A paper describes a structure:
Another distinct elongation factor, [name] (Elf1 in yeast)25 binds Pol II and bridges the Pol II cleft to stimulate transcription. We then resolve the cryo-EM structure of the activated Pol II elongation complex with bound [name] and elongation factor [name] and show that [name] acts as a scaffold and positions downstream DNA within the cleft of Pol II.
Cryo-EM reconstruction yielded a 2.5 Å resolution map of Pol II, and focused 3D classification with signal subtraction located all elongation factors except TFIIS and RTF1, enabling high-fidelity model building. Pol II adopts a post-translocated state, at the designed stall position. Consistent with previous observations, the structured core of [name] is located between the clamp head of Pol II and the KOW2 domain of [name], whilst [name] binds the lobe of RPB2 and bridges the cleft of Pol II. In our data, we observe four previously unreported interaction sites between [name] and the elongation complex. Collectively we term these regions of [name] the Elongation Complex Scaffold (ECS) domain. Interaction Site 1: A small helix of [name] (residues 528-539), N-terminal to the [name] core, contacts the jaw of RPB5 below the DNA, bridging the lower jaw and clamp of Pol II. Interaction Site 3: [name] residues 748–770 traverse above the RPB2 lobe, extend past [name] to wrap around the zinc finger of [name]. This interaction positions two conserved arginine residues of [name] (R751 and R753) to engage with the non-template (NT) DNA strand, alongside W250 of [name], that participates through π–π stacking, to collectively reinforce the open transcription bubble.
Author numbering:
A (entry chain B): 187 to 242, 252 to 557
B (entry chain Z): 160 to 268, 271 to 318, 335 to 396, 416 to 518, 532 to 544
C (entry chain Y): 2 to 117
D (entry chain a): 568 to 714, 748 to 770, 786 to 819
E (entry chain b): 17 to 83
F (entry chain A): 1416 to 1465
G (entry chain B): 63 to 124
H (entry chain A): 13 to 166, 178 to 266, 271 to 354
Amino acid sequence: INGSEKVLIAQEKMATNTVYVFAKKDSKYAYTGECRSCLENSSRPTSTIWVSMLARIGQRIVATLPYIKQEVPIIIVFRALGFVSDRDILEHIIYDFEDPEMMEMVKPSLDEAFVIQEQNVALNFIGSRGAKPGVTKEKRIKYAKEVLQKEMLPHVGVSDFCETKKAYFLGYMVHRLLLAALGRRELDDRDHYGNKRLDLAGPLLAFLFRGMFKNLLKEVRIYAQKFIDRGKDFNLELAIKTRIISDGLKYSLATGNWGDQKKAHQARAGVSQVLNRLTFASTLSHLRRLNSPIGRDGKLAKPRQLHNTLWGMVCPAETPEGHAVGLVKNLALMAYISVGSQPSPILEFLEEWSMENLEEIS
Amino acid sequence: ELSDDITQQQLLPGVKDPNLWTVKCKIGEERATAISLMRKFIAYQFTDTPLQIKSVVAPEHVKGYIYVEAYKQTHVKQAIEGVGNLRLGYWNQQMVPIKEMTDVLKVVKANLKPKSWVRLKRGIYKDDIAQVDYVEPSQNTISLKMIPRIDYDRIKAPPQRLFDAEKIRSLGGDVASDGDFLIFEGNRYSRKGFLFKSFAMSAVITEGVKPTLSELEKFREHNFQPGDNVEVCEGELINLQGKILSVDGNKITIMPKHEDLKDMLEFPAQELRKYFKMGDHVKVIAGRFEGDTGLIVRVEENFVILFSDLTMHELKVLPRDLGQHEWGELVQLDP
Amino acid sequence: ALETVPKDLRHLRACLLCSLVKTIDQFEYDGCDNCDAYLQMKGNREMVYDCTSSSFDGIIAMMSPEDSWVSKWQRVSNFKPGVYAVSVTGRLPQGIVRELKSRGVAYKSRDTAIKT
Amino acid sequence: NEAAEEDRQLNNQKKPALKKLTLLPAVVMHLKKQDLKETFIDSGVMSAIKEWLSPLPDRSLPALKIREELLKILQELPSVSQETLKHSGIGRAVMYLYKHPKESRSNKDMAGKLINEWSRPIFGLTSNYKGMTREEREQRDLEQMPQFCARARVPMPSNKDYVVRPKWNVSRLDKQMRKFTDIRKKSRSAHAVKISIEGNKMPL
Amino acid sequence: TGTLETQFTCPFCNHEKSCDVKMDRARNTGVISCTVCLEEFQTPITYLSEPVDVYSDWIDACEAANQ
Amino acid sequence: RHGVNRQDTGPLMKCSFEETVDVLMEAAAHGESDPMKGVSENIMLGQLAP
Amino acid sequence: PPIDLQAEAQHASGEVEEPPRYLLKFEQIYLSKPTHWERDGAPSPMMPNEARLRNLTYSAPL
Amino acid sequence: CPLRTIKRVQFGVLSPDELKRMSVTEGGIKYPETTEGGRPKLGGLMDPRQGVIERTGRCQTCAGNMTECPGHFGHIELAKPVFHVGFLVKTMKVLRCVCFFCSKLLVDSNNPKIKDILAKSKGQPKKRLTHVYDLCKGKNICEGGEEMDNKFGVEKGHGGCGRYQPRIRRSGLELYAEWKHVNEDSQEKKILLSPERVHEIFKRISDEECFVLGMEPRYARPEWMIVTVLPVPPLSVRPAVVMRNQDDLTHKLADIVKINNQLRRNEQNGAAAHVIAEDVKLLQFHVATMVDNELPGLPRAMQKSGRPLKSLKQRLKGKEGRVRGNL
Amino acid sequence: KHMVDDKIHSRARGPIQILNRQPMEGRSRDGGLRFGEMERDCQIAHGAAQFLRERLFEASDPYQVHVCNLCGIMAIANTRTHTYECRGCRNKTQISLVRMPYACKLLFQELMSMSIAPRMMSV
RNA sequence: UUCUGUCUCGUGCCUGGUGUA
DNA sequence: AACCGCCAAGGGGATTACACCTTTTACACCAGGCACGAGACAG
Ligand SMILES: [Zn+2]
Ligand SMILES: [Zn+2]
Ligand SMILES: [Zn+2]
Ligand SMILES: [Zn+2]
């Protein structure tokens, strides 16, 4: 870039489309069934949901839906998806009714949601907390329907009728929260690398380019608007401001600030660094470097500790000894990072083997 | 014959009138918006959803908003919905309070009429006060009384002073004199020693002149500073002496000089006059001797006469007023 | 109807009897909508420039003059809906003001502005 | 009244009229007493204020402070009835200052708003929007009545003009919990004097 | 996302943040009153009901009545 | 800062450690004087400290 | 999201018009090799080392 | 001139009159611009009286070299007073101890408990205000309004105005007064407290009462906590780079001058009080961010360069600030 | 790569920063080593007050200002003609010169720009 | 009893990244 | 008209939620940023 050799450092982040039951002890929640959800390779930002159990007749389960200004009892979310009876809702959570220990734990949530039964009432309850106050009943309900369809758990699908799949996935997040609360299953570990993915130069650039391209279409919109409101014909060749991608990409790769220059102080810094050409082993290792987005000066040792899960993946010895100790990592000699592939071939093979589609099964 | 203002108080707005709501428009597109909002009103007035707005005010003195009058705020909105320059003032409109409504149609004194006083802004005529005598019915050009600032092509490879028609006729050029009437250098219309050439409307600014008495003779910001001794010369408190404390435009705060009055008093600067007593030491800060200093030797109602300390001359002054070389430079004096 | 709204916001002038704002060519071609039987400024420009002035401040687009406060304060309530000036400077010549008085129309100065 | 008359005598002698301006603080500090405003108005304060606002023999305006404070007081003295304004002439005395050329712009604004405030009642108008009743608005509202995407799209509030007003849509545990809370309080290792541990809220 | 609203614009006089909600949790009823035009509405509430639900019931009654 | 800024020491000494600006504003609003007797005050100025 | 533009109704006919709307859909993408154009527009393959020496940005047009 | 050592220093709020007197830029600073072309403006932000600007040049005010003259102060006469961030919390305390409408202290200085405070806090104003303020918490009426104090020739009551006091609340940078008990059915229960209204209130506080509030009028009179004359720092405090690129303070001052000009112009041509209120809302923001740009909630002031300005508080923030980083 | 010749650095009245007029930072800028707070505290513990004063005043940013004995505000001082005046007091005499570090002058000037009077009451 | 040397201490700044003890 | 009791308010106290400040010394280098669209007048 401008004659400077720049390397994109691989940025680790929590693995999307997966459920993690943590225990944020310093909060009003005994347990938190986090799930940060991301449609497909198809790009949009990841939206995250949290199915928590309050600390404290007690142990009520609440979901934090995207765009919904307040926590909603999960039983209301299931009624909103159309599962009105308590039996039907529990069928998506407590797969084996022969388990009194688990059922006794959902009663507090069925109790909290006793005053709401019909689907439209649950949809209204969610709507009034999502939509702005003056929205009509139809728009407010329809908006809650869209938030549940398109925003909650996008990886499950966003089509017109995914609500049954969504009921099963949300039920699974509650089931797993119950498992963790009962202690039948150990909590998830944030440092276990099976729960981490590395954003290499590809997903990093796709993250910028998505923004710039969306900006480029913003400019074609305002330019053509100026021409077509006057009844004239807007020439798109003038509407495309070439510079937005060119200088956009270039800028973030040059400074390392991974975001729009207008808001530079809000985006990540140092994602792109000047390649170290002092010695060949430094050049090679700089091209094989992993970075943890954890804020420096953090007192917590766990994110910096050599977790057992790094064996053979990350070098156990090569880390800076300064303030970045343990946050900056390096790939092991035979460590490969998957580039990714579409799941459709696998799904087709599974469907032809003896797999019941989730929508078909009792 | 009932006075005009008394017959006016009758029209004032009340709670029962349609409220005047501010909106927010793109600066300089307030008039184009208000008019386009007329076309919108006209287009909808016969359909199933006519616009519920009464009037749209776009004052000239304001720059940033038009105001929509409607009974209920949400009526203003349905009108401004989809209207582009008013897209910024869509989310909120502030009701101008019933007592701050009459002062929306307030106008304080366009002003392009003969026998008026105008000032120049661009060109060589920087900050120059002039007078308009006649306006052409075609309104293509306007006649003005002004004083030239050109050199006449001799300084090139100046202050304001009255024009004279004899020292100019010798430099050359196409000069045509027919007595008291002269024409020169691109129709420089002149009569009885005065120029009458016409000006361009973009270069002359009509408002913000407010002429002083000195202009009346061709065709009062005070020197007060904290610490000045003053005497009230006009109004209810005439002959009160006090010391200035603060100066804020033409508002002056003074500490009255009496054992019986300790509180601060504020007076407009027109109402005060400096005063001095024999033996005070003072500096002239304006006029013919500005920068000179000395002791006051005598005081008269008309003027103070002071003895310049170093140049040792008597020097008369008004009470209202009280680079060739560098330090260390070598100078010859005598040969 | 829209014949009364300014065609273009270039060369705008306000009638000086009723303060209605229209383009110079709109007055010249169609005349003033509110005041024609007492002034007779349709068909010439000499009368137009004598009575009608370009020096006006602010515009009020009057949509319902019958029902509006701004219309009352401004004495335009009995006029046709159109764009009006907030304040127009000037006075009629010493001919039509006399004719108007003779015809029973009390000419009151549209110069609403306060001086300094 | 004594102060204003003495200032008339002093003005004839072309001396500074200090008596009114010397009493002004004491007067302003009392006209502000809410419990006495009725007594003040009914005792003829409007007549005295008219005397103080009135121009002097040489037709000069009173001290700037007097106009500033008396105009501000009049704004804070709203109980004034029409007969009080008409009999005292305070209306004339303020309209005078509003027209007067030597009056400052802020005083002209105060006098202007006073004149509007005092004339509205004459025409039955009012400026307190919270003063119009509920039925008056409901009736007026009837009097004014006329003849794809990949993500959830945020709906926007209803702009509908609502005319019609809708009909309305219409312990044994805490005693034991209080007893247990009292037992908890009773168990505490309290002290008679709360010792300031870090010097905060140190007494005297 | 953000904090839930607790003051509302009177759907009749449109005066901003002029309406407040009193919640009588004992009689199971919410009462909303415009501190400007004094308009009021009352609706049955439940323990889940928040001020935003009352205001919505008011809007739903208005939107249903203004037809 | 909660303990030492509350000490009756001079505003400049306080200002030298945490909450530097607000303590100076506090002193200004209260017209507080600094005796110039500590090591820090004499060091802010170009004076031989005690 | 494909562009959908609808002109602001100017109401000049004095009636509610149906303003024209514009649709654009971005389709196939092509990317050429990294290319350097001299200031006169003459095309040349840009060598990384040239870029490194001349301070260019080794990029391809899209 | 005799050599001297600082035996003592004293802090105080700069009086607006003190500023206008010490300032060299007579008439205030009016022009946002620095140079009208080649030379610096005499009433702009690069006023040569306000210290020297070019190397090997001379200060007009003192003829000192670049390395010798201190920067001489200038001032901007604000059209409408504005609150001083950093004194706002303090103004709220004083404003809640004195009665609105008449500014008398809500607890008479003769009261026994106040006498106790004054007796026990001699030389400790900071502690004094804290204790008297704790007395003026449960006081929602200006007592003794029932009695005429001056007998007009015809134990002592408080002699107040009898008015119910507002409870003042802060919303970022704006102050609001709220009445729960109203004196008159016509009085509005909620008003925006303009800094001009608080200036009127502080001006009326007697010098005895403000000594009670722990503010010696000789050094920190309460109305001086409202910005009505803004001290423009000299060029030495905000020097311009040459390669002239202006400093963050010059840019903020340019904005303040621009709006100050626009605002006084809106007053002269009689714009409505609501235009002014929306404009003072901007002047207030800029004056506040010129001292503290780390203020909570409000949008941080940023140059279109894509970076936040570094205010006077930031210059003293802490590490790398004047005290820690340079003294 | 850590060769000593790329690290060896010495200074004796090199260039000065335009704002605080203190030795510049950095080796290429021909800067001076920072005499940090911990070093100040180490000299305080040593009781070497004259070395401490020299380091933090005489050898960093020595400066003189004229202060009004009546108000402690920095007065105008025209050394060319030896006329000194404190605008505000208008005394034009009864002024005194104080030796204070440039950063301290800087600070008292930043404090006036917040409307704080750090009155240098030398008398 | 034609002249003629006449040159002496200039300077970015912020932010971010990597590295040293 | 007097005294015993319940009712209301005062006020001081108690307990819970939101706002603010701080987060080790120095030292070297590097590279990037440093606002830009656009409209009105003069040889
Ligand atoms: Zn007409
Ligand atoms: Zn100087
Ligand atoms: Zn009071
Ligand atoms: Zn002094």
